[PDB]
């Protein structure tokens, strides 16, 4: 499921890629929090070390901190900039994909618990309750985390998203 | 330009020029497309020439139309781009591609400027086939004074060296159309065999018409030299150990249309990179894709 | 000034008459001191204009004497010594003193040339080895004179016809005690038989990787190649030229034939062609390895040293 | 200090400026129990080194990596004294050792470039552990980057060129050449193998193992066999030690020879190394340059007798088996590195920048 109500990310956005390959024109990377889609990254001239060390699997794999610099909803591309993430830039966005991950984490365990056959019911329940957290808190993202460490040791303020007994239970046995 | 123009379109600019190649034509069709494209994604262009080239590679069966393809695509991705809404990006991109086309314009003439001082008076020039490159250098070699005699193969599955010797021959220059088996029988009069490419693959061998290669083992043979005229944009990243290594759409009751020689079959290439030695070719193309 | 002219006008006229001084490096050194006095003596507010002096004399020194190429080659370095400068201080008044000190730099690295070649010269001669050169060259016999420190081999000294100039290296080599025998230049294919590796010399390097050298080494260079005995090419890199084998054809050095036929000979001189090429020209398929002063390389790598020690667009000087 | 290890045999008379030593023989049989000169892990590697436990020239290469992490990790900084010159006046006389075990690969003498470099690099202003974890992430680097993801990557360069339903030759044990044939079983192609193997190592019969356990069919022969072969074989690849200056190959011994008689029969040949096995030595035969094994090992049980069992007693036989080899480049069609599909010629100016 994707990280945040929307099912693509907006323009001038930080964002977490893991790289898929590398090309001429660019590295085409997939972006973990839109579901895996699929987008593309350019390559100054200066960062062009093809002929000389090249071993092209080292970026095969890794994860990297990128700024949203182009997005086309429709026809479903989204361009990337290593060169203008800032450090501050990146280090947030180590920190939001880590949130991400970790309540990513969580809503697995719980789609995994009432056993949803469906990944749309999955989906649909766990972006259902980050998104209405997420509004209630005005944070996308960090608002889920928040709200899972508050069950830990406050449970109740889960009971009123009634998804099923056993997502709750779940969740608050993985957080606390 | 929904592909169909696409192949429309390159055809017109082939028969436009009957004097020019077919990689540029495919070159100027890929700087059409980006020209009038209108897709605003630093990414949303590069899947739809990759789409061009392809239609590019189904209606050309060259091996110069991909080289020049992947030469284009690197080319005109090459600057900083940073791009704020794809305007700036699709305009250097567009200024790059007329730049390359340039170059790439200029390049024949360098290497007749550059190949035509191996020719020396009274020499018996081999050539296989027809190709404007070979044609060009030996018009510099007679704008420099110089007599020579041409010996001409024909090609057979297309009389194309007796296109070649037509047209070779309004410029008044001695030339024999020889028959293609006779390349063992004229070898010991040819004291050197010029041969225009239309594919370089990475160890310094060459991709060309049927004939080139027993031409060359007979160059080989009987110790004369055999030297490569092509440009930069035929340079290809394949390395083919035998003659069926060749990627079998580029070769086409067994009627191949493209042969391979290898490199140390060959003397010299004259690349609009330079006069290079076949190891040059290796670290000058692998440099040159960059 | 007019004594700039004096010395330039003397190097011209001497590179005309005869081989002076008599050895290359010795050539090079006044040709780079040549060349930083001109670089001294001379009043420029861009590089190009000093391109183009250089440019000109550069034209008037290669065209005294074609068949040498080192004062050639040594212009074509300064020149491109003057574009790197030009190219690092663009991206400008203190352009002179840097291309002195280029060109200071240029002359230490150039006087540890034969020294150097020398240093590797071990990883090359084993112990009871037979080794053939061909001519005299400095460079080859402080090689094997130094070699033979610590090694004991054998040297065949082959001369060469039109001016016995391997009788020199051999009393040279016999001084250092290598075993050195002398042969005619006749009989280089038959004893190509016994002959371990093939040491020589050159006079210049093309960019090709084919060289031309004393005469005579062409055919050297095919025995050895029907032997497939090794070939070494001690030569340091003033003697690396971009200029391809066929251009104009002016690559021979051509003698008086006195030395082939005298003038003693009859009324047959008169109904004869006495010919007598000094140089010769060897490809580089028959050529195994160079050494450099910077090391050992491959015929396949001359063009890198081309790229890196000249610039394209002097090629034609 | 260290002693020398002792010759043995009648030396060869070409090669008498290469050291020929015993495996029978150890150096550490006078040296002490607490490893107090050279670090034990040296000691430990020196020893299994020298009675041939470890053979590969990727196998070397590791186990000294990761010996010089057990002497990093166990180091301690004298006083008033900096890491960036002790530390490799230490680990000298440690590769001293190491060479009078046995003489080095050429990639262990690269990685013992790094390793120097690497050493040289490390700042004065840091501290001693957390120097010491730099250099434990450098080496982990290094090995990680240089041959498993080096081996990746001429892997997948390799199953491009190997097709379906030909042969392929191999010689000797290599990692490398046994990795790309299994990640080309593995990801489709339908091939046999032969392999030729050479005595006295009879190391083939490992790669013999290493194929049929991962399905391969496979067919075992020696290096005088190979011209009956060669007319089956449509390709050979093989494993080289060291790429040279002047793009010759240094490999087993058999590896030039194979060379030679695949041309003979027009067989095109493909060397797979990895770029930090290059040498800027350079050499043009193989005489100036080697190492020679035992020359008692050469002796085998053909019935009753050896031959070479007292070959020591004739004073006029000369016993040599020789380790490495070297091909000019004119034999070698492919290289491929992690770099890419180069040819032979091409090799030290791709290398070199």
Redesign the interface.
């Known amino acids: 499921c994707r990280f945040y109500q929307h099912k693509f990310p907006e323009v001038e956005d930080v964002v977490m890629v893991n790289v898929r390959s590398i ?4 590295a085409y990377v997939s972006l973990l929090e839109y579901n895996n889609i699929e ?2 990254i ?1 390559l ?2 200066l960062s ?1 070390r ?9 970026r095969i794999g890794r994860n990297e901190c990128v700024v949203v ?2 997005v ?1 909803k429709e ?1 479903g ?3 990337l ?1 290593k ?2 993430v800032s450090p501050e830039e990146a280090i947030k966005c180590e920190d939001k994909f880590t949130k991400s991950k970790t309540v990513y984490s969580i809503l697995r365990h719980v789609a995994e618990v009432l056993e949803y056959t469906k990944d749309e019911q999955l989906e649909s329940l766990f972006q259902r309750t980050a998104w209405v957290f997420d509004d209630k808190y005005k944070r996308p993202g960090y608002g889920a985390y928040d709200a899972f460490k508050h069950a830990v040791s406050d449970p109740s303020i889960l009971d009123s998203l009634d998804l099923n007994e056993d997502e709750r239970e779940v969740l608050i046995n993985n957080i606390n | 330009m929904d592909d169909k123009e696409l192949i429309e379109y390159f055809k017109s600019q082939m028969k436009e020029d009957p004097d020019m190649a077919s990689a540029v034509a495919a070159i100027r069709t890929l700087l059409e497309f980006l020209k009038r494209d209108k ?6 262009l ?1 899947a739809n ?1 990759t789409s061009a080239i392809e239609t590019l590679c189904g209606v050309d069966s060259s091996v110069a139309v991909s080289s020049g393809g ?1 030469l284009f ?2 080319f005109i ?7 704020s ?2 305007s700036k990006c699709k305009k250097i991109m567009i200024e790059r591609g007329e730049l390359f086309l340039r170059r790439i314009s200029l390049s024949r003439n360098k290497i007749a400027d550059l190949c035509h001082t191996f020719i020396k008076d009274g020499a018996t020039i081999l050539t296989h086939a027809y190709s404007r490159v070979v044609l060009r250098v030996l018009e510099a070699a007679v704008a420099a004074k110089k007599r020579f005699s041409v010996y001409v193969t024909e090609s057979q599955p297309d009389l194309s060296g007796k296109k070649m010797a037509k047209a070779l021959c309004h410029l008044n220059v001695p030339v024999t159309v020889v028959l293609d088996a006779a390349v063992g029988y004229i070898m010991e009069k040819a004291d050197l065999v010029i041969v225009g490419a239309e594919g370089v693959v990475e160890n310094g061998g060459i991709i060309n018409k049927i004939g080139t290669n027993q031409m060359a083992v007979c160059a080989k043979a009987q110790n004369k030299p055999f030297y490569v005229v092509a440009e930069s944009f035929k340079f290809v990243r394949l390395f083919p150990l035998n003659q069926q290594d060749v990627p079998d759409k580029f070769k086409y009751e067994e009627h191949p249309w493209v042969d391979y020689t290898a490199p140390s079959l060959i003397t010299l290439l004259f690349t609009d990179l330079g006069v290079l030695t076949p190891s040059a070719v290796s670290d000058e193309l ?2 040159l ?2 | 000034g007019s004594e700039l002219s004096e010395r330039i006008e003397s190097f011209v006229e001497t590179l005309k008459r005869g081989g002076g001084p008599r050895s290359s490096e010795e050539m090079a050194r006044e040709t780079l001191g040549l060349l930083r006095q001109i670089i001294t003596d001379h009043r420029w507010s861009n590089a190009g204009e000093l391109m183009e002096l250089i440019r000109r004399e550069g034209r008037r020194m290669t065209a005294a004497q074609p068949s040498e190429t080192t004062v050639g080659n040594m212009v074509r370095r300064v020149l491109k010594i003057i574009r790197e400068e030009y190219g690092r201080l663009h991206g400008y008044a203190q352009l002179q003193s840097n291309i002195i000190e280029a060109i200071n730099e240029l002359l230490v690295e150039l006087e540890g040339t034969m020294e150097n070649i020398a240093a590797q010269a071990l990883e090359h001669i084993h112990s009871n080895e037979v080794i053939m050169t061909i001519g005299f060259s400095r460079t080859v016999e402080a090689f094997l004179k130094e070699a033979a420190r610590k090694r004991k081999f054998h040297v065949i000294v082959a001369e060469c016809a039109p001016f016995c100039q391997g009788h020199e290296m051999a009393v040279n080599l016999s001084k250092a005690g290598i075993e050195t025998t002398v042969m005619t230049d006749a009989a280089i294919f038959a004893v190509m038989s016994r002959v371990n590796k093939v040491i020589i010399g050159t006079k210049t390097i093309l960019a090709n990787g084919a060289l031309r050298a004393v005469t005579g080494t062409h055919t050297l260079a095919l025995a050895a190649k029907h032997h497939s005995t090794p070939l070494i090419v001690c030569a340091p890199m003033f003697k690396l030229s971009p200029q391809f084998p066929n251009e104009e054809d002016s690559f021979h050095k051509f003698v008086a034939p006195e030395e082939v036929l005298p003038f003693t000979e009859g009324d047959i001189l008169e109904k004869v062609s006495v010919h007598c090429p000094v140089f010769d020209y060897v490809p580089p398929e028959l050529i195994t390895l160079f050494i450099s002063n910077i090391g050992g390389n491959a015929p396949s790598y001359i063009y890198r040293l081309m790229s890196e020690l000249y610039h394209p667009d002097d090629h034609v000087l | 200090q260290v002693p020398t290890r002792k010759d043995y045999g009648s030396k060869v008379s070409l090669f008498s400026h290469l050291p020929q030593y015993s495996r029978q023989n150890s150096l550490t049989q006078f040296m002490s129990i607490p490893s107090s000169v050279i670090h034990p892990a040296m000691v430990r590697l020196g020893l299994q080194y020298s009675q041939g436990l470890v053979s590969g020239s990727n196998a070397r290469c590791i186990a000294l990596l990761r010996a010089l992490q057990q002497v990093i990790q166990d180091y301690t900084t004298p006083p008033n004294e900096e890491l960036s010159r002790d530390l490799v006046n230490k680990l000298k006389p440690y590769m001293s050792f190491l060479t009078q075990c046995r003489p080095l690969s050429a990639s262990m003498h690269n990685a013992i470039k790094f390793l120097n470099k690497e050493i040289t690099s490390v700042g004065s202003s840091k501290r001693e552990e957390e120097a010491k974890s730099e250099l434990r992430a450098a080496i982990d680097r290094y090995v990680q ?1 240089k041959i498993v ?2 081996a ?2 001429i892997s997948r360069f390799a199953y491009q060129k190997i097709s379906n339903g030909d042969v392929i030759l191999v010689y000797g044990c290599s990692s490398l050449v046994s990795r790309i044939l299994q990640e080309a079983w593995t990801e489709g192609r339908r091939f046999r193998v032969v392999v030729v193997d050479s005595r006295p190592w009879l190391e083939g019969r490992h790669t013999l193992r290493s194929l049929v356990h991962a399905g391969v069919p496979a067919s075992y022969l020696l290096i005088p066999a190979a011209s009956y072969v060669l007319p089956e074989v449509s390709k050979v690849l093989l494993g080289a030690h060291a790429l040279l200056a002047n793009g010759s190959v240094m490999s087993r011994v058999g590896t030039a020879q194979l060379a030679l008689v695949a041309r003979a029969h027009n067989v095109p040949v493909l060397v797979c190394c990895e770029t930090y096995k290059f040498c800027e030595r350079v050499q043009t035969d193989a005489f100036v340059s080697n190492e020679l094994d035992d020359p008692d090992d050469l002796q085998c049980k053909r019935g009753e007798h050896v031959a070479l069992a007292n070959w020591q007693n004739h004073a006029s036989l000369r016993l040599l088996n020789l380790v490495y080899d070297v091909t000019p480049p004119e034999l070698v069609d492919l290289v491929i590195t ?3 599909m180069i040819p032979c010629s091409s090799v030290p100016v ?1 290398l070199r ?1």
């Open positions: 090309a001429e024109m660019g987008g593309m350019l100054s001239e062009r093809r002929i000389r060390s090249i071993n092209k699997l080292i610099i182009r086309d026809k591309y989204i361009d900039s060169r203008r | 897709g605003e994604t630093i990414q949303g590069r020439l992947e695509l690197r991705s090459l600057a900083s781009l940073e791009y809404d794809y692998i440099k894709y960059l | 980057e993801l080096a990746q990557a992690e770099l890419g791709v920048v």
